[PDB]
Design a protein around this nucleic acid. Sequence first.
RNA 1: UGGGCCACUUUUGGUAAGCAGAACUGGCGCUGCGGGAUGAACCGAACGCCGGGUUAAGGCGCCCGAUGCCGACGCUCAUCAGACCCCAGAAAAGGUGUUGGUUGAUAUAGACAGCAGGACGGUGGCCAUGGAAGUCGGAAUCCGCUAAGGAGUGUGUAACA
RNA 2: GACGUCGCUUUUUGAUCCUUCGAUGUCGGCUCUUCCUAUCAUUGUGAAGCAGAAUUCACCAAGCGUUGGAUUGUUCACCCACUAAUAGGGAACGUGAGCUGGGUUUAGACCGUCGUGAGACAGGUUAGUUUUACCCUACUGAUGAUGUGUUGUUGCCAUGG
RNA 3: CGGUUGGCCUCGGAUAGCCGGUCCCCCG
Lengths: 201, 49, 131, 52, 190
Amino acid sequence: EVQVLVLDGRGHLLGRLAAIVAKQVLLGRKVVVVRCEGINISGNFYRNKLKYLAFLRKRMNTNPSRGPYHFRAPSRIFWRTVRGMLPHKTKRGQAALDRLKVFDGIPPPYDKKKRMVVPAALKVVRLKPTRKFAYLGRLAHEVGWKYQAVTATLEEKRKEKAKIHYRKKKQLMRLRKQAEKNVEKKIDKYTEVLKTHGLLV
Amino acid sequence: VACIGAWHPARVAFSVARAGQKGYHHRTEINKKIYKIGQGYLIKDGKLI
Amino acid sequence: SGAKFRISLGLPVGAVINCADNTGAKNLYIISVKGIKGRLNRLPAAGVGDMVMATVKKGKPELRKKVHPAVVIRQRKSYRRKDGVFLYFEDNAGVIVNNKGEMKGSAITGPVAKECADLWPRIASNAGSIA
Amino acid sequence: IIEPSLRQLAQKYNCDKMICRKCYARLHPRAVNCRKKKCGHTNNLRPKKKVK
Amino acid sequence: MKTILSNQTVDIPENVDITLKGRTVIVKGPRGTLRRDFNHINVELSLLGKKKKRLRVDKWWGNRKELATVRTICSHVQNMIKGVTLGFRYKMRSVYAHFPINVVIQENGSLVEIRNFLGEKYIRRVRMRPGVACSVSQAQKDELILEGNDIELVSNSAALIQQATTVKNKDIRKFLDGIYVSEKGTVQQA
RNA sequence: UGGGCCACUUUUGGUAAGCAGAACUGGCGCUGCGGGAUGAACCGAACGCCGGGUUAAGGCGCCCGAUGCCGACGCUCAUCAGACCCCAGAAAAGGUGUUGGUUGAUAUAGACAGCAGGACGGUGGCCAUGGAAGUCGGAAUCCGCUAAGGAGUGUGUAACA
RNA sequence: GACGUCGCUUUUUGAUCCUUCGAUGUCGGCUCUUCCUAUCAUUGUGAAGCAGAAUUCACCAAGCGUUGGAUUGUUCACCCACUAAUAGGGAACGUGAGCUGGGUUUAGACCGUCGUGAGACAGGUUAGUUUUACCCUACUGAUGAUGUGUUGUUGCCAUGG
RNA sequence: CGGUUGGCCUCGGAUAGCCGGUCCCCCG
Ligand SMILES: COC(=O)c1c(OC)cc2cc3c(c(O)c2c1C)C(=O)[C@]1(OC)C(=O)C=C(OC)[C@@H](O)[C@]1(O)C3=O
Ligand SMILES: [Mg+2]
Ligand SMILES: [Mg+2]
Ligand SMILES: [Mg+2]
Ligand SMILES: [Mg+2]
Ligand SMILES: [Mg+2]
Ligand SMILES: [Mg+2]
Ligand SMILES: [Mg+2]
Ligand SMILES: [Mg+2]
Ligand SMILES: [Mg+2]
Ligand SMILES: [Mg+2]
Ligand SMILES: [Mg+2]
Ligand SMILES: [Mg+2]
Ligand SMILES: [Mg+2]
Ligand SMILES: [Mg+2]
Ligand SMILES: [Mg+2]
Ligand SMILES: [Mg+2]
Ligand SMILES: [Mg+2]
Ligand SMILES: [Mg+2]
Ligand SMILES: [Mg+2]
Ligand SMILES: [Mg+2]
Ligand SMILES: [Mg+2]
Ligand SMILES: [Mg+2]
Ligand SMILES: [Mg+2]
Ligand SMILES: [Mg+2]
Ligand SMILES: [Mg+2]
Ligand SMILES: [Mg+2]
Ligand SMILES: [Mg+2]
Ligand SMILES: [Mg+2]
Ligand SMILES: [Mg+2]
Ligand SMILES: [Mg+2]
Ligand SMILES: [Mg+2]
Ligand SMILES: [Mg+2]
Ligand SMILES: [Mg+2]
Ligand SMILES: [Zn+2]
């Protein structure tokens, strides 16, 4: 598999998705992770916010410009978690970190592609439903990310365009079913071949 | 400045006073009240200021 | 009503001004200024209209070895007066008052600044001229 | 001259309460344990003193 | 310890019409309509009758902490049913010792302004929650009547007003001035 | 060589100490290697130069080899969670947070909690009039003429409240 | 909060002697930055034996502030005065190629006590050389470098304050 | 200087619920 693997970050848990992404990107496999503002973290919003604010407190007090850089965008927060799971002080880890690319929302080389899902990092699979969780977008916005309103409006536009394309696809599928019902008498010879070998229940 | 930091942060911090450039600085001052807007040197005839 | 504007102080703690009323004091030696929170190494200083704690160095013996509140009425240092004019006096002078602003004496020799005459109505009553 | 009915209304909202001896929280008059995680939900309570 | 099944039931009157779009209750009685989303609790809700209209809620392998939510959901739905049949009214009385508390109701019962609370010059303005109407009573002298369909909105508005008129840096065993909720009744009383 | 040091157990002085001093065995010193992230001494195991196989102690989300098992049963939510010999940080005391258990008690002659009727009387005998024809620091304490009622735990009191 | 009892801290002083004796400049002040919180003031609160005013006890909280002098080398102290308050500490008991050199702590000298004496004194007194940065880093400013073919103009904001 | 050895051109999502298709109302 030589193509790019495009994952949708919405509904996924941060560290589990980061671990999967890190092993893939070390094994090769250019990975794009879109919609990093939809990533979930387990534990309630307040204690996740406190963890981030303790991280914000960590600062080189001789030169904070030299010190640890606290990125605010959810894409860069996810990227830094994968960076923490990578061996980034080596050329191999740096090549993997370059092989990874992250985005807030879905930019338009990827809004017209199929996004995959990692069920081993999904919130509905890995958390009990009676447990609190947080949103990376809300957490980022309250620790100082500037761009959650523009991302929301652009995502609304993208969702409208996707609804239009999906209605086109549904009309095409209805036409294809109608065409099968029309010319079934000349594909009956070929249909029974496929039914015999397990295609076409 | 007689002392620049303690022994043991082992570095001069960014927050002690050092010598260097003074002035030629970009500043943004607010709440400056306009008292009058002038009108320039118009010529109707033998002109008027 | 109205609060006093900031004037130039120029009358620090160790200053010896002259007592300007008939109490029998001649000198006032400032030791303090009423209302100074201060700053590291900065000497507390007074201007016209300020209440100070003062001792009298030469004068009557029943005044001499004590601390009195006093009000500075004339300063040799020039201060802007917000109608543009800078004003200064020939001397430095103050009068002994009590805690609520009543003069210990009864008559003031010489001019009294307007910046203290409007603040202290009992001082301005005893004054001869308001310069 | 404040009416006794309104006075007991305001006293129901301001005076008839329990105080936690460990943290000082203002608790409903039938409380047995304090609600605050600060004191560890202790059962060491006293009534709120009265001006009477 | 996980109970196999914990369940209980709410009866529905004839003049109300309720619809369940999943864990979303729409109540449709005579005084309007209400709607509440319960999708933070894992229960199942079901309508039973065709002329008696029972509503069951079921919990299905919960522990104690989630078995509480069964009775909580049913009480919330009963408050919705009461709100659309009879509607909630909170009567709150103004209590003062010296300075009379002057309350003026700005636009269409949606804003309240308290002027002379404890002789202070600051005018406090409380915005009512949407769908809650405040008015001055006519039967008794110094009393607000605030009415609505949602018990949560009406009671939160009353608590808003009550915590607006609060006394600071004084003895709250003396200085008992304020505006306090005197009773929580309904409209039409039947 | 005649400076030793550390560890289990025993042990002396000392509040104690990575303190000082002994016994016994093992180590380190004189010793690399696997693990304990890191570390003279811990745990495994001691070493010529290599290939294959297998292990110990230790592990198996990712860094990082190995659970990417459709692993088993429970417990636990922390607005300072917790997370592995030495070891690198906590106690007395509490919690109507939740889970299990021990023992005792009440209940169709109907529990518990709420809707409530008579729910009280000479005798307050005694006590004490600075306090009882209800509710009081003292010793006290009966019968009520009762479907069941005090010398009250209820109504902040000398009070018939 | 008595009799008792459980702790924390390393801003006290001890105990120890592991590091340093082919040298880590040894008191205090001045200057300057930063941190802590066990909060004096200020913000928001709860309690009172909180009527008001004043005060006391707690909580979130270290953002911000916490002074001018007399005497002493002093750290400490004590007083005068102002103040919202005049809180407490750490950073090699911060800070000597930053200063100063009053103290201590070489050589001169005086006194008291001790010693036959030479001399001693963790007793008093007085006089007594404080050296070097041009290296690396750090920091403060100053050119520049790296891709977009070259070059210019107008701009955005990651991140740091 | 080397990698590589067919492509996927797309609903939003829910998870104590979903997906698809039609007859009667409403949206220029
Ligand atoms: C105790 O405070 C000192 O640390 C200290 C000091 O503090 C400034 C100065 C000096 C000065 C000196 C000496 C010191 O020892 C000394 C000491 C210890 C000497 O020893 C010296 O040679 C250098 C010498 O041998 C002959 C003389 O006296 C016999 C001295 O004068 C001498 O010439 C000198 O200059
Ligand atoms: Mg100074
Ligand atoms: Mg209820
Ligand atoms: Mg008060
Ligand atoms: Mg030897
Ligand atoms: Mg030993
Ligand atoms: Mg040796
Ligand atoms: Mg050997
Ligand atoms: Mg060995
Ligand atoms: Mg090893
Ligand atoms: Mg370890
Ligand atoms: Mg081998
Ligand atoms: Mg490991
Ligand atoms: Mg692996
Ligand atoms: Mg030593
Ligand atoms: Mg030793
Ligand atoms: Mg040495
Ligand atoms: Mg050396
Ligand atoms: Mg040296
Ligand atoms: Mg040095
Ligand atoms: Mg605190
Ligand atoms: Mg600041
Ligand atoms: Mg030092
Ligand atoms: Mg130095
Ligand atoms: Mg020096
Ligand atoms: Mg000297
Ligand atoms: Mg010498
Ligand atoms: Mg000499
Ligand atoms: Mg000498
Ligand atoms: Mg002799
Ligand atoms: Mg000397
Ligand atoms: Mg000399
Ligand atoms: Mg040069
Ligand atoms: Mg910023
Ligand atoms: Zn409490």
